[PDB]
Structures are given as structure tokens and as C-alpha cells.
């Protein structure tokens, strides 16, 4: 899905990046970029949805034979050089529950704060369980979204892992 509105927009970003790879130098890219913009704005006012789709059919087909064989990919993005590079250093937080007490003495203050955070999760869970139950449309939720908290001092449902996920560059 994504509707003809989004589907066309994505092509714009994807087509631009490939162009940026092909032309290499910024100046040539900028000039050749503006030409690209013109082709997009030309049919931006087409009010025939049936015709609008046909523009996309040929538009993508044109792109398929314009794509740079090696398009530039951001280093830390999927398919990039550094993608998943640091996943070895990311250790999930629950591993700290197994530390030897002698080790935990080395970091007293942090572990003390951890106990506070753990207590928050345990108490909030029962409340968090209810909130999803009542809002849930019988027959299973139809979408993957979640509802924000509806009371003071109540945390949004299912917040532990999003909050405590390992940092981007742990070490």
C-alpha cells in the first residue's frame, strides 16, 4: 500500500540519491537535480488518478535503467560498510542480573539506581496490562500502534525494551 501519494514520493528520494551517485560532483548533481525536479512538478497537477498511476509505471521503469550499479549507501545503514558493525559490543541489560556481588560492589551507585528502575517496571506492569486490554478491539488489534499513557505517573504500555535498548556505540 502507501497510496499513490507516498509511492511516488519514495521514487523521488530514491531517484535523487542514485543521481547524486552518478554525477559525483556536487555542482553537476545540483544542476542535474533541478532538471529532475522539473519532471516531477510537470505532472504534479495531473488530477486524473488513473493517468497519474500510468506516469509511475513508466517512471519506475525508466529508473530501473538509470540506477547506478553501485549506489552510494550511508555507512551505518543497511547494506553499508558499518551496518551491524557494533552489534557485538551491544550486550543486553539483563546480563547484569548475573554479575557476582563482588563485581557489583565496583559500581555501587549505578546498581543502586538500577534497582530503582527495576522497581518502576514491576509495579507499572499490572497497570500497563490493563490499558491494552480495555483499548483492544475484540478480535485482535488491527494495527501495530500503541496508546500513550492516559494518567499522570503512568508509563506508555510496553516501554522497557525501547527505553533500555543498548546504546548506539556502547564501547
Amino acid at each position: 500500500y502507501l497510496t499513490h501519494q507516498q509511492k511516488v514520493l519514495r521514487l523521488y528520494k530514491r531517484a535523487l540519491r542514485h543521481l547524486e551517485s552518478w554525477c559525483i560532483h556536487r555542482d553537476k548533481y545540483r544542476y542535474f537535480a533541478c532538471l529532475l525536479r522539473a519532471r516531477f512538478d510537470e505532472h504534479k497537477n495531473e488530477k486524473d488518478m488513473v493517468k497519474a498511476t500510468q506516469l509511475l509505471r513508466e517512471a519506475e521503469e525508466e529508473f530501473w535503467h538509470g540506477q547506478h550499479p553501485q549506489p552510494y549507501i550511508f555507512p551505518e545503514s543497511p547494506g553499508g560498510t558499518s551496518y551491524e558493525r557494533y552489534e557485538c559490543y551491544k550486550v543486553p541489560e539483563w546480563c547484569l542480573d548475573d554479575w557476582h556481588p563482588s563485581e557489583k560492589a565496583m559500581y555501587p551507585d549505578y546498581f543502586a539506581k538500577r534497582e530503582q528502575w527495576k522497581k518502576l517496571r514491576r509495579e507499572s506492569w499490572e497497570r500497563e496490562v490493563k490499558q491494552l486490554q480495555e483499548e483492544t478491539p475484540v478480535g485482535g488489534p488491527r494495527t501495530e500502534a500503541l496508546p500513550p499513557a492516559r494518567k499522570q505517573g503512568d508509563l506508555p504500555p510496553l516501554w522497557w525494551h525501547i527505553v533500555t535498548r543498548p546504546r548506539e556505540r556502547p564501547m
Binding site: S21, W22, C23, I24, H25, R26, D27, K28, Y31, F32, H65, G66, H68, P69, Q70, Y72, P75, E76, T81, S82, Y83, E84, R85, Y86, E87, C88, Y89, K90, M171
Partner: protein, 547 residues
């Protein structure tokens, strides 16, 4: 004899001690990388002392200290051979590794497993000196498969990445396919002769040795990434750049050639193999260099530069010039290590960016790195009286003026031209033109370690070739009489390569759209060999399995 034999083995035992102190003792953690760097620092100097003795009087040793196993009429000993190839190579490998062990202290400072990384770098070096000094084929295998493992463990250094794990398994798969040739030679010599020792092999000199040499050549095809088994060397750039510099460009990849340089006494008689090694080298030097032009990642380009050169070593083997290929290996190590180390400075300054398209305008922002990136690049192409000149020039002279395959003679020269084209592309895109990297500028190379490491190998890329070429004893009848054009064919094509390259770069400035040429797409996608073969073969073997 006393000094030669004793100090030949202190080097090997000196490198192991840092490994031994990891398993026991507790005198110094935290400072392990500098402890290792000093071991190679001292192991080099101790390795020079035997080298000077070899230069002075051509002294050569075999040391078979330990008797390990006697399989009836087959006796296996821990035999080290300190001859022409061992004595020259060890200081070169130690000198190159010395700087890298110092460039890794900077390039890998943040990584918390820094001590583990230095343990693996040293464990490779130990398995490489074993490979070169080995005197019998079985001991050669320990080094042969010792390096193969240490590639797996280092290529997949960042084991979270799924591409790193794929690239490591790919390295193993191609080498072990080549190591079918190694065992075939091992089986043949035991069956037809009676030893895995090299001495007895050369003494008997089998006249009909087509089968064992095919097996030996097949090992070089896989280990040194020749055509048919080459995709792993590009894909093995997934490891940390110090790994790619020390292993997959300076040393480890030469072991495939080093195996054939060991067996020149047999290959010299066998013409039928000489053709194959010449043809095998001829295609690989062209193909990889042809692929090098259209690449966009600095590591990948320098990776194909290694393969294209390695093929030139394989051609030298074919034209029956084994001692030059050895010289090319030693001279090649210096500037190819410097290239990678310099490309390490760019990547580290630009926040882990390997695409040259997003590099530029560094010619003034990084003086020291830029100077070396020029010095190294000039050596590769064939700048007169640089380290690369003393080896590459003669190889072209001996190829032109020898009974050879016509197409192989032609492909070598074409590839030498291409070596000029992508020597510039690194310079033009990475050093010249207005900057193209992200806004926030953090380009800073003012660190003693990165500088001292680059400085040392920079000297090697200048004077190492001149010293080595002069000192080493004469071993063949060099050809110095030839038509003028054949004499300077190397320089002309290098010059003709530059002219075409600079014109191509300028055309990139001109505001004209990009037009896809089939020749262009074939270049960029590596000829589709990686795509077709890493999809058809895995699919068939995995799918056939269930039946």
C-alpha cells in the same frame, strides 16, 4: 654458523613469548599492544643479523632440531630452512608488520578487544614465518592452514555484522578448494618419491611431474586469489583495515606465489605448467585491474590492486623468472601496506566512509597522508627509481623478450596501463577537487603513532627497492640488450595510461548526463562472477543436500 643458526631461531621464539605471557603470568595487562609492538621491533633487528651474513658470504642453513614422527621410511622433523627466500622475506615482513602493529594502536584505540586483536595479528605472523621457513611439505601445511584460519578469525572481527561472517566463510571456502591441490602434491611426492622434504624432492627431480605441479598451482590459485578463486580477496576487506593491510595485501596473499617460488627447481623443467601459470596470471592481472577502474570504495580499489599485481607475480613465475617474482613480493609489500595505512587515515578522519565519491579536497587538509598516498601510488604504476620500479620494470622486460604466449604478453601490458588509470582515480577523487564529505570537519592526523608508522614505510617505498636489488646475489642471466621500444614499453604504457585517465577525470566535471555502457556495468559488478557463482553454487549444493 653458530650466530646464524642461533639468531635464526630467536626471531621465531621471540614472537611467541607475547603469546605465552597471555596464557600465564599477570605482569602487564592494559599495555599489551605496545608490548607486542616491541617484540616485532626487536625480532626485526635480530632478523637483520642473519640477513647481513647471507649477503656477505651467501651462507645458508637447514635446522632440523626435533624429530617428531617416523612413519616407517618417512621421517618428519621440525625443519627450518634459512635460505635465499627465507632470509630476505622475514625482515621485510617484520618491518611491514612493525608499522602496522603501530598503525593498529591508533586505528583500533577505542575498540575494547584491542589486546585480543594484537594476539591474532601476532598469531598470524607466527604462522607466516612458519610457512616461509618450512623445509618439508607437512610443516608447510601447518602454515598454509594456519594463515587460512587466522583470516577467518580476523576478517570476521566484527561478528555482529552478517556480511563479515559471510566474508570469513568465503575466505575459508576458496582456500580449502585450493588446498585440494596442496594435498594432491603431498600425496604424489610420498607415493612417487618418498619424502615431503624439499631437499629430497629436488635431488630426484622427477621428469614427469605434470600432476604434482597442477596440484601446487591449484593451491596458489586459491591462496593468492587468482582467477577462478579470486572473489574472496575483494570480499575479505570486511575486516579492520589493519587486517587488510597486514594480511590480504602485504603478506598472506603472497604465500600462493611463495609456494611456486619454493618449487622452481621442478617447474623450470616443466614447460607445460609454465604455460598454465603464465596464462593463469595473464587473465587475473587484466580482469581484476579491469574491474578496479569502476570501483567506488577505496578499500575495494586497493584490494583489486593487490590482485592485479599478484597476477603479475604469477606471470613472472610462468616466464621462468622465479627470482624476480620474489623481488616483486618484497618490494610490493612496502607500498601496498602504505596505501592501506593511508586509506586508513582518510576513513578514520571522515568518520568511517570508504566511498571515494564522498572524499576530496584532502590534498591540503591531510599533508602527511596525501604525500604518502602519492608516493605509494607512484611506486605501483612504475615511477623510475622507486621501490616498484626495480621489480615491475624487469618483469616487463623479461616478459617482452622471452618465448611466451602472445595473448599473455599483451594482457600483461594492457593491465599495466590499467594500473595507471586507477592509481589516479584514488588520487583524483580522494585528493583533488573541492571537498564533498559531510559538513562537520574533524580531519585530524596529528598523532605520532599514525605519522611514525606512515613515515617508516614511506622510506621503504623509496629506498628499499634500491638496497634490496643491489645487495641480493645474482641468480640469473639478466637481459639488458633489447630493442629500445621493448626496453621502455613499461614507461610508455604507464605514461599513456595517465594521459587517458586525466582526460576521463576531466570529462566527469563536464555537465553532461551519465550514459550506461555494458562495458561499464560489467566492470562495476566485477564481471558478475561474484553474483552468479555465489548464487548458483550455494543454491545447488544446499538444495541437492535434502535429496
Amino acid at each position: 654458523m653458530n650466530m646464524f643458526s642461533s639468531l635464526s631461531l630467536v626471531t621465531l621464539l621471540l614472537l611467541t613469548m607475547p603469546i605465552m605471557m597471555m596464557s600465564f603470568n599477570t605482569y602487564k595487562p592494559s599495555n599489551y599492544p605496545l608490548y607486542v609492538k616491541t617484540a616485532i621491533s626487536y625480532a626485526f633487528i635480530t632478523s637483520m643479523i642473519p640477513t647481513m651474513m647471507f649477503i656477505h658470504s651467501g651462507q645458508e642453513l637447514i635446522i632440523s632440531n626435533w624429530h617428531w614422527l617416523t612413519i616407517q621410511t618417512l621421517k618428519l622433523s621440525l625443519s627450518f630452512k634459512m635460505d635465499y627466500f627465507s632470509m630476505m622475506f622475514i625482515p621485510v615482513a617484520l618491518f611491514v608488520t612493525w608499522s602496522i602493529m603501530e598503525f593498529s594502536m591508533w586505528y583500533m584505540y577505542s575498540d575494547p578487544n584491542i589486546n585480543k586483536f594484537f594476539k591474532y595479528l601476532l598469531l598470524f605472523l607466527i604462522t607466516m614465518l612458519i610457512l616461509v621457513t618450512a623445509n618439508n611439505l607437512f610443516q608447510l601445511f601447518i602454515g598454509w592452514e594456519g594463515v587460512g584460519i587466522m583470516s577467518f578469525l580476523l576478517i570476521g572481527w566484527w561478528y555482529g555484522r552478517a556480511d563479515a561472517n559471510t566474508a570469513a566463510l568465503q575466505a575459508i571456502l576458496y582456500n580449502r578448494i585450493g588446498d585440494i591441490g596442496f594435498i594432491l602434491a603431498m600425496a604424489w611426492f610420498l607415493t612417487n618419491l618418498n619424502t615431503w622434504d624439499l631437499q629430497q624432492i629436488f635431488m630426484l627431480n622427477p621428469s614427469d611431474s605434470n600432476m604434482p605441479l597442477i596440484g601446487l598451482a591449484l593451491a596458489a590459485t586459491g591462496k593468492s586469489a587468482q582467477f577462478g578463486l579470486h572473489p574472496w580477496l575483494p570480499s575479505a576487506m570486511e575486516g579492520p583495515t589493519p587486517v587488510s593491510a597486514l594480511l590480504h595485501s602485504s603478506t598472506m596473499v603472497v604465500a600462493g606465489i611463495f609456494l611456486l617460488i619454493r618449487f622452481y627447481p621442478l617447474t623450470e623443467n616443466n614447460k607445460y605448467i609454465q604455460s598454465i601459470t603464465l596464462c593463469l596470471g595473464a587473465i587475473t592481472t587484466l580482469f581484476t585491474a579491469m574491474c578496479a577502474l569502476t570501483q567506488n570504495d577505496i578499500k575495494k580499489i586497493i584490494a583489486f590492486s593487490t590482485s592485479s599485481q599478484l597476477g603479475l607475480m604469477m606471470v613472472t613465475i610462468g616466464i621462468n623468472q622465479p627470482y624476480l617474482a620474489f623481488l616483486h613480493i618484497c618490494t610490493h609489500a612496502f607500498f601496498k601496506a602504505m596505501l592501506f595505512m593511508c586509506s586508513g587515515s582518510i576513513i578514520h578522519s571522515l568518520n568511517d566512509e570508504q566511498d571515494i565519491r564522498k572524499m576530496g579536497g584532502l590534498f591540503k587538509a591531510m599533508p602527511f597522508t596525501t604525500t604518502a598516498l602519492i608516493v605509494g601510488s607512484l611506486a605501483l604504476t612504475g615511477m623510475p627509481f622507486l621501490t616498484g620500479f626495480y621489480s615491475k620494470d624487469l618483469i616487463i622486460e623479461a616478459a617482452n623478450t622471452s618465448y611466451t604466449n602472445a595473448w599473455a604478453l599483451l594482457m600483461t601490458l594492457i593491465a599495466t596501463s590499467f594500473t595507471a588509470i586507477y592509481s589516479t582515480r584514488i588520487i583524483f577523487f580522494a585528493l583533488l577537487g573541492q571537498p564533498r564529505f559531510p559538513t562537520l570537519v574533524n580531519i585530524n592526523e596529528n598523532n605520532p603513532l599514525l605519522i611514525n608508522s606512515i613515515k617508516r614505510l614511506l622510506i621503504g617505498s623509496l629506498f628499499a627497492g634500491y638496497i634490496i636489488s643491489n645487495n641480493i646475489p645474482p641468480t640469473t642471466i639478466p637481459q639488458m640488450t633489447m630493442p629500445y621500444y621493448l626496453k621502455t614499453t613499461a614507461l610508455i604504457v604507464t605514461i599513456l595510461g595517465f594521459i587517458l585517465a586525466l582526460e576521463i577525470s576531466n570529462m566527469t566535471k563536464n555537465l553532461k548526463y551519465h550514459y550506461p555502457s555494458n562495458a561499464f556495468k560489467f566492470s562495476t559488478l566485477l564481471g558478475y562472477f561474484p553474483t552468479i557463482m555465489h548464487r548458483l553454487a550455494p543454491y545447488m549444493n544446499l538444495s541437492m543436500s535434502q535429496k
